[PDB]
């Protein structure tokens, strides 16, 4: 049977707007705004997004739709790079190992968000310690006795009744069901492949736009929401002389648009040739930080009505990550006229910002072992059902009472330094081993015109140097684990490294079982390994354009 | 799907052919039907793409004109000025039908054009 193509290009760019756009674009962008300069901080962001991330984007859409493959059999381009698709594919699992506990948060607070009294606004609960004080009374973040933090922490996580990850319990049976509801959730969008994911991403990918508008034009009202709002776009030009600054703005630009990592190359692989993937790229990248940008405002809106209302500065109240959305954010929520229905909407935002992003990370899995396995791409259902099932039972560490440490070692571990290693892999192997000439060749043979100069140059030297220049601040700033004021063993530390290099080593080890596997002398193993698979009956004439140096030469 | 090529032959340089495409099993007029050449690896040669546009390699851009006729569900590659480096025989190739469709990425068996 022919690969399906998306029953619409809605349902492509949608699916690569989801994906692409989720709670990082809400919370982790708008606190580095804030924390790097405010709209200074926009010059080293728009500027990696045009330099790397963008190019990036390009890469992946425009490889994916003209080899129409996933990220592993997308490498008979270059076969000694498979093993850079494999390390993609084991680390989207392992991201789906913690992220979809995340929306199952969001999913526990949406379902507890069905009451005219919320959870997190009183103190007297079963999960409320005697310290619970009345947040009307009350850096304001990391103070632990508010309702919502305790609930989240004692009601939610129940991390009170872990000492640390030497001993995390067992999962807790409501995170449970929420988890179960979430793999159920995409399984369902996932099973039958893009036809009926790429309508799914009609809602998941839409309603979190609806929810931030509603959440703009509330937030503008709120008393405060000025002065959050000028904390937020503050310009300190002053803070673009730090080396941290620029790190962030990369770091961000990479970990936010998700080039490289699988999906966008398992979307694209399911377009029509004709495409204009260029446009898509440019335009799904665009979406994605103005986003974040314009997420920023509502967050700092809700900061600044915070703020005032226990009359300290926004330094003191402003946070990001799942403090944010699940501690402040909750707080001011109850504080508002119909907080009932700021919580619902808010929560299924949430739920819709990481819902698609789950169906990007696991799609990319799907299509890219059903590609290499001709078994995985005749039973979509059983393979669609064992890898959500592998999700959810792997997950189910995370859920555990020391859930949070785990998680935190995931979120640290399973797309880092290893990501990174494997998107510099990938654009190297592309631009300079397969050809930045021949992915221009390529996409003329689609569009109709080569990439300028611009996009082959960002190929073959910016993107590359971007991506080394993140991954060797990805390994010297490198902190040891640590959660709040946990501070992780050092086992812990040693698991997590496992888990960086057991993506990594794949790349290396799949050369070396490559190059053994393959007959013949060292040169002509090396050709085949560096030649596409359609064109190995030239290594035996010895027509190898990467054993001249007019290959390598050739931008 | 099926794709059946005619038209090919020996022809002298600077002369006109032109290479005939039936396809039958999708329709043409919204499908992505190219042209591919092997004298050498197979190359890419011209395409008349799902709404109408017509791309051509850069080697054959000004000489060669593909055309689709949605009434035969045929495609048609009038190639002109041939010269002895167009010599090869010419795939025609439909990747996909469109967008609610499959990338069936099927080629003829091909048409033998033998210049000079």
């Known amino acids: 049977q022919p690969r399906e193509t998306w029953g619409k290009k809605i349902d492509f760019l949608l699916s690569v707007v989801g994906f692409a756009v989720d709670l990082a674009n809400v919370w982790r962008f708008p606190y580095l705004c804030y924390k790097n300069g405010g709209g200074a901080f926009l010059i080293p962001y728009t500027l990696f997004l045009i330099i790397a991330g963008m190019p990036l984007f390009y890469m992946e859409l425009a490889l994916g739709q003209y080899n129409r493959e996933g990220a592993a059999t997308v490498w008979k381009i270059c076969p000694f790079f498979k093993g850079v698709g494999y390390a993609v594919i084991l680390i989207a699992l392992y991201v789906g190992f913690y992220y979809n506990v995340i929306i199952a948060w969001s999913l526990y607070y949406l379902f507890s968000s069905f009451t005219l009294n919320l959870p997190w606004t009183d103190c007297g609960h079963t999960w409320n310690s005697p310290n619970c004080t009345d947040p009307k009374l009350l850096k304001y973040s990391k103070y632990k006795f508010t309702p919502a933090a305790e609930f989240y922490e004692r009601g939610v996580l129940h991390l009170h009744e872990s000492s640390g990850i030497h001993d995390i319990g067992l999962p807790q049976w409501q995170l449970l069901l929420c988890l179960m509801v979430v793999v159920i959730v995409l399984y369902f969008s996932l099973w039958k492949g893009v036809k009926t994911s790429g309508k799914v991403v009609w809602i998941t990918a839409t309603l979190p736009y609806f929810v931030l508008f509603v959440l703009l034009v509330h937030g503008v009202t709120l008393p405060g929401a000025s002065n959050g709002i000028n904390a937020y776009l503050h310009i300190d030009f002053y803070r673009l002389k730090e080396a941290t600054v620029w790190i962030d703005a990369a770091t961000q630009i990479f970990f936010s648009l998700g080039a490289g990592f699988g999906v966008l190359i398992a979307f694209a692989s399911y377009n029509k040739f004709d495409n204009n993937c260029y446009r898509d790229a440019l335009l799904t990248s665009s979406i994605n930080c103005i986003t974040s940008f314009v997420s920023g405002f509502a967050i700092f809106s809700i900061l600044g009505y915070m703020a005032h209302e226990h009359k300290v500065n926004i330094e003191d109240v402003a946070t990001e990550g799942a403090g944010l959305v699940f501690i402040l954010y909750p707080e001011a929520i109850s504080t508002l006229s119909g907080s009932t229905f700021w919580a619902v909407v808010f929560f299924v935002m949430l739920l819709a910002l990481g819902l698609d992003s789950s169906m990007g990370g696991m799609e990319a899995v799907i299509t890219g072992l059903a590609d290499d396995f001709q078994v995985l791409k005749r039973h979509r259902k059983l393979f669609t059902f064992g890898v959500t099932f592998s999700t959810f039972l792997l997950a189910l560490f995370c859920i555990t009472k020391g859930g949070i440490y785990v998680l935190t070692l995931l979120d640290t571990f399973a797309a880092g330094t290893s990501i990174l290693f494997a998107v510099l892999m990938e654009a190297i192997g592309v631009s300079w081993f397969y050809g930045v000439d021949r992915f221009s060749n390529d996409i003329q043979q689609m569009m109709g015109f080569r990439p300028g100069l611009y996009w082959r140059l960002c190929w073959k030297f910016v993107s590359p140097a971007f991506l080394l220049f993140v991954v060797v601040v990805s390994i010297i700033n490198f902190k040891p684990l640590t959660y709040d004021d946990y501070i992780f063993p050092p086992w812990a530390n040693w698991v997590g490294w496992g888990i960086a290099l057991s993506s990594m080593v794949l790349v290396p080890i799949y050369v070396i079982y490559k190059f053994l596997s393959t007959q013949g002398s060292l040169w002509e193993r090396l050709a085949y390994g560096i030649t596409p698979e359609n064109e190995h009956h030239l290594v035996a004439q010895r027509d190898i354009r990467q054993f001249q140096l007019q290959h390598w030469l050739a931008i | 799907v099926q794709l059946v090529e005619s038209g090919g032959g020996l022809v002298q340089a600077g002369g006109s052919l032109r290479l005939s495409c039936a396809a039958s099993?999708?329709?043409?007029?919204?499908?992505?039907m190219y042209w591919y050449r092997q004298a050498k690896e197979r190359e890419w040669v011209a395409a008349?793409?799902?709404?109408?546009?017509?791309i051509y390699a850069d080697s054959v851009k000004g000489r060669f004109t593909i055309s689709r006729d949605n009434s035969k569900n045929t495609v048609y590659l009038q190639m002109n000025s041939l010269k002895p480096e167009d010599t090869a025989v010419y795939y025609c190739?439909?990747?996909?039908?469109?967008?609610?469709?499959?990338?069936?990425?099927?080629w003829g068996q091909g048409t033998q054009v033998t210049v000079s």
């Open positions: 190739n439909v990747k996909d039908a469109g967008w609610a469709s499959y990338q069936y990425d099927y």
């Open positions: 099993g999708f329709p043409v007029y919204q499908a992505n």
């Open positions: 008349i793409q799902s709404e109408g546009r017509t």
